[PDB]
Amino acid sequence: RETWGKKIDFLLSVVGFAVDLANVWRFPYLCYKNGGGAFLIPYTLFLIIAGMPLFYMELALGQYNREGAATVWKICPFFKGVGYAVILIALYVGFYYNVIIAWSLYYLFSSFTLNLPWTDCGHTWNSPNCTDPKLLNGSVLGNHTKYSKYKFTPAAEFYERGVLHLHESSGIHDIGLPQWQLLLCLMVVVIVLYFSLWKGVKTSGKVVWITATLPYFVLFVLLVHGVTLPGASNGINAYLHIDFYRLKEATVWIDAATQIFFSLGAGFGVLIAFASYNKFDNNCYRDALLTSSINCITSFVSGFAIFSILGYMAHEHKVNIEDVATEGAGLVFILYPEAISTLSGSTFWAVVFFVMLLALGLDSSMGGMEAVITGLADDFQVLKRHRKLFTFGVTFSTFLLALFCITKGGIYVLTLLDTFAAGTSILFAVLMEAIGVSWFYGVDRFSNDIQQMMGFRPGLYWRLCWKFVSPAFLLFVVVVSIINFKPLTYDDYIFPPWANWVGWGIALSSMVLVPIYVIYKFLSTQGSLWERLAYGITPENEHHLVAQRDIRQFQLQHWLAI
Amino acid sequence: RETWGKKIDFLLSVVGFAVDLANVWRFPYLCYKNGGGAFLIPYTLFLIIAGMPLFYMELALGQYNREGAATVWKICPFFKGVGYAVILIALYVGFYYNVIIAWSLYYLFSSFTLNLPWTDCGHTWNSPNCTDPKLLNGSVLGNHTKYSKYKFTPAAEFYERGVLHLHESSGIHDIGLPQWQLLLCLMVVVIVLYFSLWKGVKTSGKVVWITATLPYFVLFVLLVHGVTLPGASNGINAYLHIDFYRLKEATVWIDAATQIFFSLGAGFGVLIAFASYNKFDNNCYRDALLTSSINCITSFVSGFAIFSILGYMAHEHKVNIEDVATEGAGLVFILYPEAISTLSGSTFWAVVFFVMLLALGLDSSMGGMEAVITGLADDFQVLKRHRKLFTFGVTFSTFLLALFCITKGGIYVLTLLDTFAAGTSILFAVLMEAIGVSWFYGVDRFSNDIQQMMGFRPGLYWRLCWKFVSPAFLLFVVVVSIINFKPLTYDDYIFPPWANWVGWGIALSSMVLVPIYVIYKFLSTQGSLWERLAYGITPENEHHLVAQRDIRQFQLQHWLAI
Ligand SMILES: CCCCCCCCCC(=O)O[C@H](COC(=O)CCCCCCCC)COP(=O)(O)OC[C@@H](O)CO
Ligand SMILES: CCCCCCCCCC(=O)O[C@H](COC(=O)CCCCCCCC)COP(=O)(O)OC[C@@H](O)CO
Ligand SMILES: Fc1ccc(C(OCCN2CCN(CCCc3ccccc3)CC2)c2ccc(F)cc2)cc1
Ligand SMILES: Fc1ccc(C(OCCN2CCN(CCCc3ccccc3)CC2)c2ccc(F)cc2)cc1
Ligand SMILES: CC(C)CCC[C@@H](C)[C@H]1CC[C@H]2[C@@H]3CC=C4C[C@@H](O)CC[C@]4(C)[C@H]3CC[C@]12C
Ligand SMILES: CC(C)CCC[C@@H](C)[C@H]1CC[C@H]2[C@@H]3CC=C4C[C@@H](O)CC[C@]4(C)[C@H]3CC[C@]12C
Ligand SMILES: CC(C)CCC[C@@H](C)[C@H]1CC[C@H]2[C@@H]3CC=C4C[C@@H](O)CC[C@]4(C)[C@H]3CC[C@]12C
Ligand SMILES: CC(C)CCC[C@@H](C)[C@H]1CC[C@H]2[C@@H]3CC=C4C[C@@H](O)CC[C@]4(C)[C@H]3CC[C@]12C
Ligand SMILES: CC(C)CCC[C@@H](C)[C@H]1CC[C@H]2[C@@H]3CC=C4C[C@@H](O)CC[C@]4(C)[C@H]3CC[C@]12C
Ligand SMILES: CC(C)CCC[C@@H](C)[C@H]1CC[C@H]2[C@@H]3CC=C4C[C@@H](O)CC[C@]4(C)[C@H]3CC[C@]12C
Ligand SMILES: CC(C)CCC[C@@H](C)[C@H]1CC[C@H]2[C@@H]3CC=C4C[C@@H](O)CC[C@]4(C)[C@H]3CC[C@]12C
Ligand SMILES: CC(C)CCC[C@@H](C)[C@H]1CC[C@H]2[C@@H]3CC=C4C[C@@H](O)CC[C@]4(C)[C@H]3CC[C@]12C
Numbered sequence A, B: 001r002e003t004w005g006k007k008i009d010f011l012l013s014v015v016g017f018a019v020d021l022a023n024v025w026r027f028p029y030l031c032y033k034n035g036g037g038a039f040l041i042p043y044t045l046f047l048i049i050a051g052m053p054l055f056y057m058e059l060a061l062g063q064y065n066r067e068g069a070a071t072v073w074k075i076c077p078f079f080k081g082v083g084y085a086v087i088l089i090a091l092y093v094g095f096y097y098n099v100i101i102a103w104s105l106y107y108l109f110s111s112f113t114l115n116l117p118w119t120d121c122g123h124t125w126n127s128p129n130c131t132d133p134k135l136l137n138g139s140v141l142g143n144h145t146k147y148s149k150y151k152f153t154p155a156a157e158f159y160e161r162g163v164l165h166l167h168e169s170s171g172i173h174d175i176g177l178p179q180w181q182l183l184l185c186l187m188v189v190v191i192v193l194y195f196s197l198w199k200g201v202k203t204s205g206k207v208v209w210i211t212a213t214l215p216y217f218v219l220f221v222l223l224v225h226g227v228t229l230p231g232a233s234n235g236i237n238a239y240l241h242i243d244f245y246r247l248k249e250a251t252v253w254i255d256a257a258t259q260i261f262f263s264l265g266a267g268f269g270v271l272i273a274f275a276s277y278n279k280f281d282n283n284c285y286r287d288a289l290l291t292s293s294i295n296c297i298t299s300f301v302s303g304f305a306i307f308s309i310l311g312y313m314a315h316e317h318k319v320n321i322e323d324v325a326t327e328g329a330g331l332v333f334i335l336y337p338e339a340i341s342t343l344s345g346s347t348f349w350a351v352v353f354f355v356m357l358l359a360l361g362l363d364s365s366m367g368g369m370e371a372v373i374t375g376l377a378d379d380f381q382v383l384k385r386h387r388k389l390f391t392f393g394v395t396f397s398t399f400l401l402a403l404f405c406i407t408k409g410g411i412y413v414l415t416l417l418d419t420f421a422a423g424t425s426i427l428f429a430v431l432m433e434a435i436g437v438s439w440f441y442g443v444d445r446f447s448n449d450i451q452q453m454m455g456f457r458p459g460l461y462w463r464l465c466w467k468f469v470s471p472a473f474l475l476f477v478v479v480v481s482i483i484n485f486k487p488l489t490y491d492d493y494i495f496p497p498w499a500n501w502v503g504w505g506i507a508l509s510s511m512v513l514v515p516i517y518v519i520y521k522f523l524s525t526q527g528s529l530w531e532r533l534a535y536g537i538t539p540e541n542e543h544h545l546v547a548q549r550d551i552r553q554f555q556l557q558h559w560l561a562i
């Protein structure tokens, strides 16, 4: 197998893997929806007890097995159907992650102008209900009209109408035809993606070089700008005020878990595919610690900047912080452009920011496509030779199925995918992974593999998390997601029940791949129930132990190792 | 390869292969839409000059090459991308052919009653605009209300509302959710289909035994009943009156060509897959002659019976024959039930008729699925071993993509598929087949293969048709289909332009597989333009002639063989 170059394997190169479109695009609106401040505690908790242990586990498993997402379950076949699951999950993510890049690409085409289109009203897409904060002298409708989401701001008008053209659709039932601008943007995105995958894993490149310094620089500039804005202090106070009533709810914990899994990459097969090309002496412990710490710091500073910009916009518009902006996937494309417009030389900063989030999106999607391709090629060796045609077909299918999110009402389908395709499905997938690694495979064998790879055994904390803490918390979040499910709703649009049923069906498409595979493995195995179960719960390299009637899983000492 | 049993290879067993769901379901409404009588002349012409020559050609090619639909182009690789085309075409057919069986299945569940649901009004699905011919004494709205399609008859009300529930949808944009009755019907259909394919080709069975006597018996009974009905004579006169103004149009010729290709099976890969399991001495000439003759006779008698029933219904309803019934895929499910209701013991005859058309549908769909599976297995030998899982996946995908036609507005999608998926696409496919066989491969080699298989060379007529007549007529019908395309319309519902664009895109999906494949073959071949073209236009067993610089296609004597 291939090996990552020394440029990407450097000690200071973990910062590149510690930022993602999720940390800059998903975290902001996920924290704003949960109030802010009350979301950091569940986020940090799931990071320290669930996110980082699963991160370390997936890294060690991918480094030891040298396999893809699904084939890494060569130690326990009954669980190979869960690998496919996360693979599909990753694919589902692409079905809308690439649509996001296209958005930024359009913003890039909107960034090479002296007057930014989101600065003021008066354009073609601007509706009569467009109130610019600097045009209070005219008072067409006033800076403050109503407080539900305030979608009448120039940035919101440019995003919903000038980019997505949501005004030409009333729901998910009448999305219509895809916009040709977004069509060309997604075409360029998938073209750049194809020629960035087709020759296998890229050990090092400009993509992984610019995503390590540009995101941090942009975030620092945005923080320095926001801390000196009028009204920004109010947003800071709203971000450092923890409402424990929100903690009493279950949605906050689900959002925190999903954001942790998106930022760290657990539950998509990216970590295993990445570790499959690492060295045998790579210290996954230090990598996991640094990744978790940098991700937590980045999320904290990003939420702080987002709330500062929200307070600034609330002061400029004379609206409440909870109703000044939306709570959808387009929150950053409304807060960040207006913040850049206030800085001196808005054109240059906007261009830099759009190049940055476009690069971050491309690296995030590449990683996902490479994980999917690596898994399917380790499953089918024909792909290891037909890489070019396989990547072409994967990108073409992703483009075809993403044509839905570049439609006039495509934001609804994008929210549906971001809520159901990678919602309870990824939680069930990582729960099955933890159960198959800590209970079926056993924590002792995993600790021995870690000791023979990195030279030390994990402490009691890591093993107790892998075996007891993380599986229990994953089961708990799955239960509170299934029982306490809330109907999916947009800023003001309410999804019909059939949309929720379609979302649940999409989630079950990935969820039931674990049971379906156990059935397939049981029927395809020749022998009695004992032999079938033994072949299903034992590694492929120890199937001879089935003949010797010596199975560790059939002993009480295996399940009580701890 | 497998061989068909002597039961299906009998001389009198061609009658089973001479009837299809198309001859009993598609021909009737295709002839009624074109007026009747003016449709028989183009039908017979395309049968004698285009249908039968292509039938014989495909039979001989499948018997000589012993390959599937796509692999049969081992004599000319540049044309293998057209095989896939017809394969996809066949799959497209299934996407709605199976939905038809389900319909009949529902009618079966409606046939085990003393009072047929389509006899009179007064049920739940019956709308207030339901006029029964026997209830003229009450005169709710009169036997004659308006003359566009007269969808107010009890049979039409039971079909559109009681079965399809079209009243709960206004177009193709608001089809809604699939009916659970049609859902269970399609589930039973695909279950019967899976266990009828999973063990490979069935040499002989009850399915191919009952479809040889029951269709002819049912048609004879229907003819004897219709020739003794009031008003039936008027329909006979309307069927034997040829309107040459219709012949001046182009739609009639296109419909005749499509119906010929549906009835004979040319353009789907079924003929090649069938001949791949025949004997080396099987006389395809006699088979083609008998098939064409029996198909023509069956189409004639079916149209006669359909027009007799139409005249009877027009007399009973006091409406015009051109407006007494619809012109869609549900014409037979309105004419035949009312005709059975008039016969003594309507329950038994209805049960027999529904068992017959359900069996005919199952045999027609089986043939198609077996052709697709045989082609894809000759392309990928892994399927020759994984037949079970491959058939399961194919049936599951067909069920998923047919869930669209069992929706409230699923008849619109079914008409769209029946008009565009197997419209100009199959014409272009058979044109490319004729060009690749008669011009690229050469009529002399094909005649020599026929002579070495059956012991005689084809006459001048067959070769002139394969080389000049049939390709020219196929090009002509393709031209009149593309240039003189008419917007697709239902009985009263008009499809929006985007529906026509989606239909054209679906057709192009199959059409452009020929060009895309020539590009793929050209890039995957290593060598200069001369060597690439030689490897692309020469059989796989003669590629050594490329090294000797002796290619027949590069000589004028090859293209001027005649
Ligand atoms: C939403 C309902 C889908 C039900 C469709 C259910 C088929 C189940 C076959 C199955 O499970 O076989 C796999 C290999 O097959 C695959 O690719 C992935 C199959 C997963 C299909 C999910 C597609 C979802 C869009 C397992 O094969 P294997 O025995 O582990 O290895 C065979 C070879 O791939 C490598 O050895
Ligand atoms: C609507 C746009 C689709 C563009 C998608 C374009 C890929 C083109 C690959 C291609 O053309 O490779 C084929 C084998 O691949 C296949 O299966 C069928 C491929 C056709 C895909 C059509 C799917 C339509 C729903 C030819 O492979 P081969 O070199 O003849 O033989 C390889 C092996 O199958 C047997 O030798
Ligand atoms: F094989 C690999 C090759 C490259 C990478 C890179 O990672 C990309 C960074 N994110 C990717 C996926 N994120 C969340 C998943 C969302 C998603 C999106 C689209 C489709 C499916 C899922 C987590 C991390 C990388 C970048 C710097 C680096 F130093 C090392 C690796 C990973 C694996
Ligand atoms: F491999 C084979 C095995 C069996 C058959 C049987 O033919 C079925 C009879 N029709 C099938 C297809 N029709 C039109 C296509 C429409 C269609 C429908 C669904 C999906 C795709 C396309 C033409 C003929 C058969 C029956 C009696 C017999 F004696 C011999 C063969 C054929 C090939
Ligand atoms: C085709 C294969 C790859 C699977 C595709 C899975 C995803 C992309 C599918 C599964 C169910 C689909 C949805 C089903 C129904 C609707 C409602 C319609 O008014 C707009 C499209 C929309 C919202 C679809 C979008 C795409 C969708 C989410
Ligand atoms: C199976 C997947 C991977 C590939 C094939 C996907 C095809 C069938 C899907 C993907 C997205 C779809 C499009 C999405 C939205 C619209 C706009 C609507 O007003 C007409 C149909 C149209 C134009 C769809 C046509 C079919 C389409 C192109
Ligand atoms: C091959 C099949 C399965 C999928 C085809 C996908 C592609 C070719 C189709 C699907 C939806 C289509 C788009 C639907 C609507 C519009 C808006 C209008 O400006 C015409 C072009 C444009 C932008 C179409 C371009 C082609 C398109 C992107
Ligand atoms: C609708 C569009 C955007 C879908 C994506 C199409 C992409 C994946 C396709 C379109 C044309 C293709 C190219 C056509 C020909 C060649 C030359 C060959 O020697 C290597 C592959 C290469 C370079 C192909 C790569 C994939 C490709 C770029
Ligand atoms: C020789 C051994 C390794 C068998 C190789 C078979 C491989 C090439 C086959 C078997 C399973 C196949 C996959 C099964 C299902 C799907 C989903 C579909 O939406 C796109 C094609 C795709 C992704 C197939 C691609 C080809 C595939 C990977
Ligand atoms: C659903 C839409 C997006 C179309 C997707 C088409 C994909 C799944 C198809 C199209 C062409 C196919 C390839 C054609 C030929 C080969 C060579 C064979 O030795 C291994 C499989 C491989 C490499 C196929 C893999 C699957 C493939 C890439
Ligand atoms: C209910 C449907 C829609 C989803 C689940 C279907 C599963 C349970 C079925 C569908 C097709 C089945 C396979 C069909 C044929 C074979 C070959 C033989 O070795 C027996 C097992 C095996 C490999 C089956 C395993 C179970 C299977 C994969
Ligand atoms: C998914 C893969 C197998 C390809 C599927 C091809 C066929 C079945 C697809 C291609 C384009 C599709 C159509 C695109 C758009 C619409 C309009 C919508 O209001 C109802 C469904 C309907 C009418 C779709 C029905 C299914 C369809 C005809």
Ligand SMILES: CC(C)CCC[C@@H](C)[C@H]1CC[C@H]2[C@@H]3CC=C4C[C@@H](O)CC[C@]4(C)[C@H]3CC[C@]12C
Pocket (backbone or CB within 6 Å): A498, A502, B175, B176, B177, B178, B396, B397, B398, B400, B401, B403, B404, B407
């Ligand atoms: C790629 C193909 C072969 C397999 C996957 C097809 C899936 C994605 C398609 C096929 C038919 C589709 C369904 C057709 C119609 C409806 C009714 C509508 O009110 C909600 C969506 C719903 C319920 C669709 C959901 C998605 C669906 C199930």
Ligand SMILES: CC(C)CCC[C@@H](C)[C@H]1CC[C@H]2[C@@H]3CC=C4C[C@@H](O)CC[C@]4(C)[C@H]3CC[C@]12C
Pocket (backbone or CB within 6 Å): A505, A509, B177, B178, B179, B180, B183, B400, B403
């Ligand atoms: C796995 C994904 C890709 C496809 C899922 C397809 C199946 C499971 C889905 C697609 C559309 C669904 C149907 C849509 C609507 C109805 C009507 C109502 O009575 C509820 C059940 C019923 C009848 C659903 C049953 C399940 C269904 C048939």
Ligand SMILES: CC(C)CCC[C@@H](C)[C@H]1CC[C@H]2[C@@H]3CC=C4C[C@@H](O)CC[C@]4(C)[C@H]3CC[C@]12C
Pocket (backbone or CB within 6 Å): A523, B187, B190, B191, B194, B388, B392, B395, B396, B399
């Ligand atoms: C929604 C439904 C109707 C889709 C179709 C599902 C069909 C194809 C699936 C569902 C369950 C499957 C069966 C499950 C298990 C077995 C036992 C095995 O020893 C042979 C295959 C066999 C007999 C499978 C055949 C295919 C099968 C019947």
Ligand SMILES: CC(C)CCC[C@@H](C)[C@H]1CC[C@H]2[C@@H]3CC=C4C[C@@H](O)CC[C@]4(C)[C@H]3CC[C@]12C
Pocket (backbone or CB within 6 Å): A382, B376, B379, B380, B381, B382, B383
């Ligand atoms: C070892 C050699 C023969 C290669 C074998 C690869 C075979 C098994 C692969 C390569 C091409 C693949 C097909 C490519 C595309 C599609 C269309 C998709 O909608 C369903 C899966 C399907 C139909 C794939 C099934 C598996 C497939 C046939």
Ligand SMILES: CC(C)CCC[C@@H](C)[C@H]1CC[C@H]2[C@@H]3CC=C4C[C@@H](O)CC[C@]4(C)[C@H]3CC[C@]12C
Pocket (backbone or CB within 6 Å): B382, B383, B386, B389, B390, B392, B393, B394, B396, B397, B398, B400
């Ligand atoms: C799109 C919807 C309907 C799902 C379709 C799934 C189909 C294409 C998939 C699901 C499971 C797949 C099979 C899984 C495993 C194998 C064994 C391998 O050695 C050859 C390919 C083969 C036989 C695959 C062929 C394609 C397959 C049947």
Ligand SMILES: CC(C)CCC[C@@H](C)[C@H]1CC[C@H]2[C@@H]3CC=C4C[C@@H](O)CC[C@]4(C)[C@H]3CC[C@]12C
Pocket (backbone or CB within 6 Å): A388, A389, A392, A396, B516, B519, B520, B523, B524
């Ligand atoms: C424009 C798009 C959407 C449709 C047509 C794409 C065609 C022309 C492209 C897409 C991917 C391409 C393939 C990608 C890679 C290879 C491998 C190498 O041997 C060169 C040719 C070959 C085999 C290409 C042939 C042409 C190809 C099949």
